[PDB]
């Protein structure tokens, strides 16, 4: 118990952008929390980014407008940001800094948890092998997702990534052989109608009893987006590893978070990275993405589905690039498929799931899963490489089998990918449609499928 | 008046680039004017670019070659750059800084005017609607020009933009449905051939008691190209809004102005825009182009015709691209038409005049002007499409109408555009030529002309 009284300094010596600089601080602690009282009486909170001697450099979460350098009072807490955590947080709506925004009381704490986390021994983790049946063929069939993974959705501007996210949240369950997910949902810089969409979708499907929301809208302060994905990931860690439930964490616009990161790094005059983003953005996104999985001895898990929007549909931008080095795959939402009225517009050629090989197969889903997926992928690739020069050089110079790949292209994009915004397919229906599509080709053209599997599944 | 003595400082703190830095100045004033005397007696002039406490940063118009920090003596004027302005300035030749280069005396000033001008209240303007008849059918008939417009010539290096300019100058006048311009000519960075050409053409094809020249050549100070168009435009505003004349301002190679501007910007390490040009190039070109129009209650005007040279014939370069966002149209001079010995080599598709719709029509030129113009545009574009289709599919794969378009193209480029360098076509002759060109097609192909116009003008 910190029982000594706190110190309050009226010694501000600079305001610049999001930062306030103070002098004459007594033994400044790093990462400390500060409470600022403005001249009129309003209160804000900040976190110390750098100490040096007597100086301290606070970042204010709610902006620096209205702050002067003679009558603002900064009270130092003596401790790092520990958030209050409880199990009543399910069914409640908070803002991007954890304050109640639904006419409810403040959180009566079961515990106080550090929001930077606690490192988990790599020897105490468990490898995820339980497949999540999302009910979406493009994911289930070819990019399967294990329970405990971290797999983002690479999207763009104007595309339906919120519909895909909500459908996954609504339909996600385990592969039926014989409870369900709690949901934590952080939104960084969304508009009002996206938040309206998500709230209505959660409470119209009876889920709200089991959902915690942290909402930072585009009219809210920008520097809050830095702590928002960490209060959402500190609740998810209390529920999963202390209350032992299976949590699903959605993090909407992991691009707004990185823009706020760049905005704070540019005000500190630091050696910039690529495109101006901080040079430590990799080590910063990795402390968010790597809070997911199962641990030994505890029956809880955390699955993560971040949602990016690539600037200019560019997958080599710093944000998608660095996110790909950290997460286990990606689901790629394409614009060319959107402009042709396909939903969900998932392009399976740059999509990947790195935990699929160990979550599918005999005894888990079905013995023909991996071979069907591999052959469908190879056929789609060959068909695209055909269609290119078919459009370029000669609609009649096409060979006799260079027309089977085009018919496969059409029927695969219209029958396998295109699903329906409320349709919940099993895994075995997905596999049956895959076989119905593979039956276009004579069985001699399926080189990526063994003979024992072709003999058992092709002739029907 | 300023009745106090002037202060002279030998307190130079450091020379670097084109900037001199003075210390111990007494209440330095921003944008003030300084007179420097060098150790060998030569005299230069500069302008204060920044003040701070006792420091002033002067930018010398002639350069900093030969200045030292012990004997150069700077005398502060006490006021911003004001030019002496009169009405005898018509019929005189000055250099790019305002001194006489025609063996005459200095200007006996009627007034002293600040050369930065003053933005005109947008409520006190009059929308320009009186059409200038330049006698060039490519401008009169398709890109009509009003009296008060600002419309540049987008050319390149080696093309005949100077003769186009001089022809406009010697042919221009109002439209006669049932007295003259005073020219102000500023040239920035021209060679001696161009100045010779313009001087010879003014005093031969007209009168030279109505022209005022400001000649800054290619072997003259670069930083004095920044104040030459402002001297020209201050003279123009005095002659137009106080003596109530109709002025025509010709500013030659705004590209050299923009390049001197880039050089001064790079000298003091400011934020660049595209291709290194300063980020404030739009706000700087707009203080030059926007000093052109009419006002309420005064019987003068200012018609500006800048002349550009696009690097590599690229219209996306920063100079033409930022110029086209500020001015009310442009006249595009083409190289492909010059190589076919066509004069004037004006390509009407990338041309535009934004004040044409309000200057043509019934009671202004003639009832059918706009429809003929739009139909000529449509037919020219379709002809240029067919011309490129036939380069792939050959001469004998075209239809009966594609040959009509290919005939229109030839007759248009040789009868309408091509004019001859001393030919003055009244706008009614231009419209008759346009109708003779439109009668190539049956009246059902002319799908932009209403029927009651085709009933009156097509059969004749």
């Amino acid at each position: 118990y910190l029982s000594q009284p706190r110190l309050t300094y009226k010694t501000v010596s600079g305001v610049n952008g999001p930062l306030v600089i103070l002098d004459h601080v007594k033994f400044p602690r790093y990462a400390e929390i500060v409470h600022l009282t403005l001249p009129d009486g309003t209160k804000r909170s900040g976190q110390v980014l750098e100490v040096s001697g007597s100086k301290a450099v606070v970042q204010v979460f709610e902006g620096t407008s209205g702050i002067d350098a003679k009558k603002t009072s900064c009270e130092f807490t003596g401790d790092i940001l520990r958030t209050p955590v409880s199990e009543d947080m399910l069914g409640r709506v908070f803002n991007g800094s954890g304050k109640p925004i639904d006419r409810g009381p403040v959180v009566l704490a079961e515990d106080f948890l550090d929001i930077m986390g606690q490192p988990i021994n790599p020897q105490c983790r468990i490898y995820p092998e339980e497949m999540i049946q999302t009910g979406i063929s493009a994911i289930d069939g070819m990019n399967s997702i294990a329970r405990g993974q971290k797999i983002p959705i690479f999207s763009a501007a104007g595309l339906p990534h919120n519909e895909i996210a909500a459908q996954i949240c609504r339909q996600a369950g385990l592969v039926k052989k014989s409870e369900n997910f709690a949901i934590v949902f952080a939104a960084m810089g969304v508009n009002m109608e996206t938040a309206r969409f998500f709230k209505s979708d959660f409470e119209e499907n009876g889920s709200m009893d089991n959902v915690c929301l942290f909402l930072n809208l585009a009219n809210d302060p920008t520097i809050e987006r830095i702590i928002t994905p960490r209060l959402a990931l500190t609740t998810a860690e209390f529920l999963a590893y202390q209350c032992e439930k299976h949590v699903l964490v959605i993090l909407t616009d992991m691009s707004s978070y990185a823009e706020a990161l760049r905005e704070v790094s540019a005000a500190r005059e630091e050696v910039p990275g690529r495109r101006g983003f901080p040079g430590y953005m990799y080590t910063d996104l990795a402390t968010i993405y790597e809070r997911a999985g199962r641990v030994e001895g505890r029956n809880g898990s955390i699955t993560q589905i971040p949602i990016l929007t690539m600037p200019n549909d560019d997958i080599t931008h710093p944000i998608p690039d660095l996110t790909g080095y950290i997460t286990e795959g990606q689901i790629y939402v394409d614009r060319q498929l959107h402009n042709r009225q396909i939903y969900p517009p998932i392009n399976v050629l740059p999509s990947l799931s790195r935990l699929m090989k160990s979550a599918i197969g005999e005894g888990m889903t079905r013995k023909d899963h991996a071979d069907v997926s591999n052959q469908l992928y190879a056929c789609y690739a060959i068909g695209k490489d055909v269609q290119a020069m078919k459009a370029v050089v000669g609609e009649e110079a096409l060979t006799s089998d260079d027309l089977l790949y085009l018919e496969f292209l059409q029927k695969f994009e219209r029958n396998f990918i295109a699903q329906g915004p409320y349709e919940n397919r099993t895994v075995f229906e997905t596999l049956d449609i895959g076989w119905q599509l593979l039956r276009i080709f004579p069985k001699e053209m399926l080189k990526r499928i063994p003979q024992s599997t072709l003999s058992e599944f092709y002739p029907r | 008046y300023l009745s106090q003595p002037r202060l002279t400082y030998k307190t130079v703190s450091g020379v670097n680039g084109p900037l001199v830095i003075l210390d111990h100045v007494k209440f330095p004033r921003y944008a003030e004017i300084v007179h420097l005397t060098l150790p060998d007696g030569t005299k230069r002039s500069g302008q204060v670019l920044e003040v701070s406490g006792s420091k002033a940063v002067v930018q010398v118009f002639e350069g900093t070659s030969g200045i030292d920090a012990k004997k150069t003596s700077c005398e502060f004027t006490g006021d911003i750059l004001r030019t002496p302005v009169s009405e005898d300035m018509l019929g005189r030749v000055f250099n790019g800084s305002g001194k006489p280069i025609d063996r005459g005396p200095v200007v006996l000033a009627e007034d002293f005017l600040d050369i930065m001008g003053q933005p005109i209240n947008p409520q006190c303007r009059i929308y320009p609607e009186e059409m200038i008849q330049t006698g060039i059918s490519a401008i009169d008939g398709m890109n009509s020009i009003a009296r008060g417009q600002k419309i540049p010539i987008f050319s390149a290096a080696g093309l005949p933009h100077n003769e186009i300019a001089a022809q406009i100058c010697r042919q221009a006048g109002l439209v006669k449905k049932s007295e003259n311009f005073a020219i102000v000519f500023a040239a920035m960075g021209v060679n001696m051939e161009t100045a010779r050409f313009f001087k010879s053409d003014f005093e031969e094809n007209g009168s030279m008691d109505n022209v005022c020249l400001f000649l800054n050549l290619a072997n003259d100070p670069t930083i004095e190209r920044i104040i030459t168009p402002r001297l020209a435009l201050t003279t123009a505003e005095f002659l137009a809004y106080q003596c109530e004349k109709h002025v025509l301002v010709i500013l030659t190679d705004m590209s050299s102005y923009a390049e001197a501007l880039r050089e001064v910007s790079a000298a003091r390490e400011e934020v660049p825009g595209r291709r290194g040009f300063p980020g404030y190039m739009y706000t700087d070109l707009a203080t030059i182009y926007e000093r052109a129009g009419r006002v309420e209650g005064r019987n003068g005007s200012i018609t500006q015709i800048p002349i550009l040279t696009m690097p590599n014939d690229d219209i996306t370069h920063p100079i033409p691209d930022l110029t086209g966002y500020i001015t009310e149209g442009q006249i595009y001079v083409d190289r492909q038409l010059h190589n076919r010995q066509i004069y004037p080599p004006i390509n009407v598709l990338p041309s535009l005049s934004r004040l044409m719709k309000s200057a043509i029509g019934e009671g202004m030129t003639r009832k059918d002007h706009a429809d003929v113009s739009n139909q000529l545009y449509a037919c020219y574009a379709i002809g240029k499409d067919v011309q490129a289709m036939k380069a792939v599919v050959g001469e004998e794969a075209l239809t009966s109408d594609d040959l009509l378009y290919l005939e229109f193209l030839q007759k248009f480029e040789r009868n309408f555009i091509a004019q001859g360098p001393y030919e003055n076509r009244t706008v009614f002759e231009t419209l008759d030529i346009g109708w003779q060109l439109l009668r190539i097609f049956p009246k059902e192909m002319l799908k932009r002309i209403p029927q009651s116009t085709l009933s009156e003008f097509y059969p004749r």
């Binding site: 005059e269 050696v271 910039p272 101006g276 | 390490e269 934020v271 660049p272």
Partner: peptide
Amino acid sequence: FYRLKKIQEKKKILKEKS
């Protein structure tokens, strides 16, 4: 280029004024 020149300018401002 411009960002690195800015960093160097701030370095050589700090070291001289301090």
